[PDB]
Design a protein around this ligand. Structure first.
Ligand SMILES: [Mg+2]
Ligand SMILES: [Mg+2]
Ligand SMILES: [Mg+2]
Ligand SMILES: [Mg+2]
Ligand SMILES: [Mg+2]
Ligand SMILES: [Mg+2]
Ligand SMILES: [Mg+2]
Ligand SMILES: [Mg+2]
Ligand SMILES: [Mg+2]
Ligand SMILES: [Mg+2]
Ligand SMILES: [Mg+2]
Ligand SMILES: [Mg+2]
Ligand SMILES: [Mg+2]
Ligand SMILES: [Mg+2]
Ligand SMILES: [Mg+2]
Ligand SMILES: [Mg+2]
Ligand SMILES: [Mg+2]
Ligand SMILES: [Zn+2]
Ligand SMILES: [Zn+2]
Lengths: 81, 87, 25, 217, 120, 129, 97, 206, 96
RNA sequence: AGGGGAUCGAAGAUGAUCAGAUACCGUCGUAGUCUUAACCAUAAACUAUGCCGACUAGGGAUCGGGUGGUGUUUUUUUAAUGACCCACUCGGCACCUUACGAGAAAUCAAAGUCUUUGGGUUCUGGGGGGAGUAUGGUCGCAAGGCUGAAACUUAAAGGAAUUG
């Protein structure tokens, strides 16, 4: 306060801010690869869903939508990228 | 504030905040001049020999006196850690 | 007089000049 | 016989401080008029306006008298003193002393050329007090003090030669208007013109230099 | 109500202030003191005074009384000063918090270690 | 909705000064804002600034000292006719000896003195002291 | 001029509450302005509690008080109950006692 | 300008965590404090007492710096701080003020409480608040014992402590006196654990 | 900015608006209505000459007590009838 | 204009009170009070405070959404849930303390960033009374709504704070 660095602010206080009031705005959602070991391949899923995403071959499930991040379905794995 | 031919006219060139560089005018009887003493080899405070800073009443009024002091002294050489330019 | 009874005072007053004027329409 | 209390009063009579410009430099709060008396003996007074006030009391009225005085030289030092006693001389007495104490300095300048000896102001300047805004405006030489008799006599004692003034609000209530023109010229040394952008070293406090040569007994 | 006015209490205060040695728990000599030592215009006022500078004196001897300080107190308090011999290095090791220790680690060096958790 | 984008930048700067601060993040920047920030900087009233680059309209961090009292914007860019410039600075500058009215001419955003030296005129932007 | 920030009493984000009736004088008053107290008191009283149990069946019985919420009308609230009138400051103080 | 061994030492860090000077205020937490160091959970904040040390240095580094050591003034109406200030005063120059401040002491010559100092050291700007005010009427610099919730208005140089009680204020006030002497004055070399016991300073009983 | 459009083309609004509020000025309204010429005993002119009808004895207002000695005059150019004051001690003796 | 008409209850009639008492208090109780179809368009319809945008300062609660957690409580076999807790973050209804700042003041995070006077825009006021009166227009079944003057009079009317 009174004198500080607006240009190079701490990673953490930037971290806790709203996604629109960061120094340069960016998302804070992500994508994942999801499995349900009946199948061998992996659909790519967005962290926020709206659409209850179905798998490639089997009419199984995967996740349900919510207010924000999707609730992933029961027996599943996930990596992030 | 010179004149026609050189010649320093108009008296009293005032002090100045080391925090804000605003003028520290006369009736600002709320400002302060802090003398920090110069030390030597093993303690010993060398009487009459200071590093000094002047802080406008406004600044101390706003509470910014202890943060702005930190910054001044630290980056002048008499603190290390304590202060952080970023937040 | 109470502001509102003065409003009523003249309301009547207007309705009477309303009456009286009609006499000669 | 003086006998001064306060470190600052002592250092003054002790002739260790020669001028108030010093006092102002370090903003040293005054508390003993004799300071500004020996520091500034060219001071001439002027009782600007006297008016009766009155208060009711659970047994009697009470009309004491307000008196408003302006002291100064005419070389850049003014003072605005306002005191109410139940006698006029009394109120004039205390008023002058309060006006001594209040003595602030004035920055003065050049309308617009570098010539010989400041005659006008450094900038445009406002003072407000109550509802009256007095506004002081730099003016060419020989313009004069363009102002009502009261403000003019205050600006003259102030040492100003040529200035334009403008006022707002209920000017008739003198008490606030002078207190406004006061702030108005009391504001000339808070204004950062570029010529003051120069950085000075930051002088040592007369309190520390003659530290011993002050102090109690 | 025998509540003593200010002037009586005012004067008693001042007398204790500057003539504590001389005076006593005895009005009768406190009286005689006041003659030699103070100017008063009436017998009654002197007695009314001395009796109280007495009382004031009689309860200084057991605790101070606000308002009167003959500075002998302020320095009696100075040589009445001391205590301790046991301090607060026993037993074992300065117990710290989880982060108090991280605080140590992050700036310094050696300290005896003792960690505790805590709960809601 | 957002009207003069120059307005907000100027204003934010002034309040940063008034609160005794040393920086302002301003948003959303513009050619005109830089060219203005540029003229202040040329004459001491601020430090260096920095265009940050959200892929939008931009942000600017301004570093300022305290030499500055006020930097306003003239909300309708009135036309000024080489003679009226006298009357402008006279109205909104503290003394004849310093301070600048900055404006916009066919030959660029320039303070009134460079404006007088190049002998061009145009519209009026804002001012600095 | 204005002499309360709550104005009348307790109404911000609405525009129309709804009226209740004074328990004392039946004057309508906006419920949010109402001025209310719970009249929880025992069914019996002071002395009766002994002479109660004495001439009753069951061991000490149980005892079940009465509970009714009282709405007063300012004028009524002031004329007797919770009110006094407080200084220009003590006024502000919302804390009960 | 950094000395060499005026680093925060082992014995000192030991000294502090027994007094619990790193135990800062709860939920309550004035904006003007980066003197923090990670939130201990269950509502307590830990204090970077390295800085505490480093601030204490400046405190001394300016206390000693005043041509006459007796127009340096210690204040404390906090009973916990009265036993200390008198003891800080004792060792150093310093006139003290324990108990009631009594207003009009800095303005107003006409009082018998009248002081006029070149510096102020205060243990709780909440309780001493009067003094912090009065100083600002008259160009006096102020030193302060500050917690995480203490007002920072008109105090320059904080010393981050724990006015929650116990030994800290005593400890801090002891170290103050300790270092001002290890400056220009009647002290000595390195470690120099100093004769005088820290429990000397400390509110008494019952 | 409060009210007044600051725009660079808003001249027409700005003028009209003034036009409107000039009417709240007592002298501007008087001038344009021609209250002078319409109402008002004198023609608009500075003086006017009439004939004396009766000598009156107007009693003053409070807190004054007096009889104020005036004349009802019928303006020549006008016929309009008007009561006028006859100043200074006597003078009511001059008229008839 | 139909219905409905428990209740309370303009009007009216009463019993008392009063010097009087067309009232206050008590009784009777028409219209009304509710509802459908249609009118009317006004309230201190009030936050007596236009809307959009920016900036300027601290604090604890709470309402909705979200995110984070080897948090608590729910037992079953751990979870899954839900409720709770703790930190943050948007957007709400508000209170607290300060006040750099503003005001004639009371007070005001706007009523601030205004003689250092300009982001955009709408509306209204220009001493008091006359008077929201006269008049014309217009809307309405009406009651009345909107628009809305002058002559003449007058030195104050008014606001906030103080002491009585
Ligand atoms: Mg007929
Ligand atoms: Mg006069
Ligand atoms: Mg009232
Ligand atoms: Mg409503
Ligand atoms: Mg009108
Ligand atoms: Mg006649
Ligand atoms: Mg003719
Ligand atoms: Mg019915
Ligand atoms: Mg009846
Ligand atoms: Mg009857
Ligand atoms: Mg009747
Ligand atoms: Mg209306
Ligand atoms: Mg309301
Ligand atoms: Mg807030
Ligand atoms: Mg969760
Ligand atoms: Mg009169
Ligand atoms: Mg009033
Ligand atoms: Zn699948
Ligand atoms: Zn009631």
């Amino acid at each position: 306060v009174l004198v500080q660095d607006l240009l190079h602010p701490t990673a953490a206080s930037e971290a806790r801010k709203h996604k629109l009031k960061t120094l340069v705005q960016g998302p804070r959602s992500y994508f994942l690869d999801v499995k349900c070991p009946g199948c061998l391949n992996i659909t790519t899923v967005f962290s926020h869903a709206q659409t209850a995403v179905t798998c490639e071959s089997c009419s199984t499930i995967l996740c349900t939508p919510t207010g924000g991040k999707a609730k992933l379905s029961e027996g599943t794995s996930f990596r992030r990228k | 504030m010179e004149n026609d031919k050189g010649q320093l006219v108009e008296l009293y060139v005032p002090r100045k905040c080391s925090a804000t560089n605003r003028i520290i005018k006369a009736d600002d009887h709320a400002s302060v001049q802090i003398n920090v003493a110069k030390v030597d080899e093993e303690g010993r405070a060398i009487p009459g020999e200071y590093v000094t800073y002047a802080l406008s009443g406004y600044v101390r009024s706003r509470g910014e006196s202890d943060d702005s002091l930190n910054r001044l002294a630290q980056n002048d050489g008499l603190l290390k850690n304590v202060w952080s330019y970023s937040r | 007089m109470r502001a509102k009874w003065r409003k009523k005072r003249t309301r009547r007053l207007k309705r009477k000049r309303r009456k009286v004027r009609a006499r000669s329409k | 016989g003086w006998v001064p209390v306060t470190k600052l009063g002592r250092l003054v009579k002790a002739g260790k401080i020669t001028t108030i410009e010093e006092i102002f430099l370090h903003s040293l709060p005054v508390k003993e008029f004799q300071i500004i008396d020996t520091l500034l003996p060219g001071l001439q007074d002027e009782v600007m306006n006297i008016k009766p006030v009155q208060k009711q009391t659970r047994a009697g009225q009470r009309t004491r008298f307000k008196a408003v005085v302006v002291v100064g030289d005419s070389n850049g030092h003014v003072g605005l003193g306002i005191k109410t006693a139940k006698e006029v001389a009394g109120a004039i007495r205390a008023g002058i002393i309060i006006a001594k104490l209040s003595v602030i300095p004035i920055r003065r300048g050049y309308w617009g050329t570098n010539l010989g000896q400041p005659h006008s102001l450094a900038t445009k300047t406002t003072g407000k007090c109550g509802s009256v805004t007095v506004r002081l405006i730099p003016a060419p030489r020989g313009s004069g003090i363009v102002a009502s008799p009261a403000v003019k006599k205050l600006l003259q004692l102030a040492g100003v030669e040529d200035v334009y003034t403008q006022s707002n609000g209920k000017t008739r209530t003198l008490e606030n208007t002078l207190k406004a023109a006061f702030v108005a010229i009391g504001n000339t040394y808070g204004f950062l013109t570029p010529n003051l952008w120069a950085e000075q070293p930051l002088p040592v406090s007369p309190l520390d230099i003659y530290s011993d040569e002050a102090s109690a007994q | 109500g025998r509540v003593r006015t200010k002037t009586v209490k005012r004067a008693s205060k001042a007398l204790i202030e500057r003539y504590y040695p001389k005076l006593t728990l005895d009005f009768q000599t406190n009286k005689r003191l006041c003659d030699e030592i103070a100017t008063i215009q009436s017998k009654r006022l002197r007695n009314k005074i001395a009796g109280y500078t007495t009382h004031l004196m009689k309860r200084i001897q057991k605790g101070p009384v606000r308002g009167i300080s003959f500075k002998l107190q302020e320095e009696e308090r100075e040589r009445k000063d001391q205590y301790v011999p046991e301090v607060s290095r026993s037993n074992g090791v300065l117990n710290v918090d989880n982060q108090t220790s991280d605080l140590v680690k992050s700036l310094g060096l050696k300290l005896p270690l003792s960690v505790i958790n805590v709960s809601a | 909705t957002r009207s003069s984008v120059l307005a907000d930048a100027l204003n934010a700067i002034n309040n940063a000064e008034k609160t005794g601060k040393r920086q302002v993040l301003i948003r959303p920047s513009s050619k005109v804002i830089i060219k203005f920030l540029q003229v202040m900087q040329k004459h001491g009233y601020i430090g260096e600034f920095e265009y940050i680059d959200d892929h939008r309209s931009g942000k600017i961090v301004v570093q300022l000292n305290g030499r500055l009292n006020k930097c306003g914007v003239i909300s309708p860019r009135f036309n000024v006719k080489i003679g009226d410039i006298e009357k402008w600075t006279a109205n909104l500058l503290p003394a004849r000896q310093f301070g600048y009215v900055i404006l916009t001419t066919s030959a660029g955003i320039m303070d009134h003195e460079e404006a007088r030296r190049k002998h061009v005129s145009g519209k009026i932007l804002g001012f600095v002291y | 001029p204005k002499k309360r920030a709550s104005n009348g009493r307790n109404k911000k984000g609405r525009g129309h509450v709804k009226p209740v009736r004074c328990v004392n004088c039946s004057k309508s008053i906006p419920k949010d302005k109402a001025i209310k107290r719970m009249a929880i008191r025992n069914i019996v009283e002071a002395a009766a509690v002994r002479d109660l149990s004495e001439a009753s069946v069951y061991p000490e019985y149980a005892l079940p008080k009465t509970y009714n919420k009282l709405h007063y009308c300012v004028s009524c609230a002031i004329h007797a109950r919770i009110v006094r009138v407080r200084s220009r400051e003590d006024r502000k103080n919302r804390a009960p006692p | 300008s950094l000395p060499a061994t005026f680093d925060l030492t082992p014995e000192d860090a030991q000294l502090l965590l027994a007094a619990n000077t790193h135990l800062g205020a709860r939920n309550v937490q004035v904006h003007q404090e980066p003197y923090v160091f990670n939130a201990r959970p269950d509502g307590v904040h830990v204090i970077n007492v390295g800085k505490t040390w480093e601030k204490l240095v400046l405190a001394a580094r300016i206390i000693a710096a005043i041509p006459n050591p007796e127009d340096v003034v210690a204040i404390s109406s906090r009973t916990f701080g009265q036993r200390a200030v008198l003891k800080f005063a004792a060792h150093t120059g310093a006139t003290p003020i324990a108990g009631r401040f009594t207003p009009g002491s800095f303005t107003n010559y006409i009082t018998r409480s009248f002081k006029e100092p070149r510096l102020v050291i205060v243990t709780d700007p909440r309780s001493d608040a009067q003094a912090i005010k009065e100083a600002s009427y008259v160009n006096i610099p102020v030193i302060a014992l500050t917690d995480l919730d203490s007002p920072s208005e008109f105090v320059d140089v904080a010393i981050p402590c724990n006015n929650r009680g116990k030994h800290s204020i005593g400890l801090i006030w002891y170290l103050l006196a300790r270092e001002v002497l290890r400056l220009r004055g009647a002290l000595v070399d390195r470690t120099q654990p100093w004769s005088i016991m820290p429990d000397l300073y400390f509110y008494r009983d019952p | 900015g409060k009210g007044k459009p600051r725009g660079l083309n808003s001249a027409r609004k700005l003028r009209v608006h003034r036009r409107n509020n000039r009417w709240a000025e007592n002298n501007y309204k008087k001038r344009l209505l021609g209250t002078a010429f319409k109402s008002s005993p004198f023609g608009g002119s500075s003086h006017a000459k009439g004939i004396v009808l009766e000598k009156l004895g107007i009693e003053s207002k409070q807190p004054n007590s007096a009889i104020r000695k005036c004349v009802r005059v019928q303006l020549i150019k006008n016929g309009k009838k008007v009561t006028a004051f006859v100043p200074n001690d006597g003078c009511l003796n001059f008229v008839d």
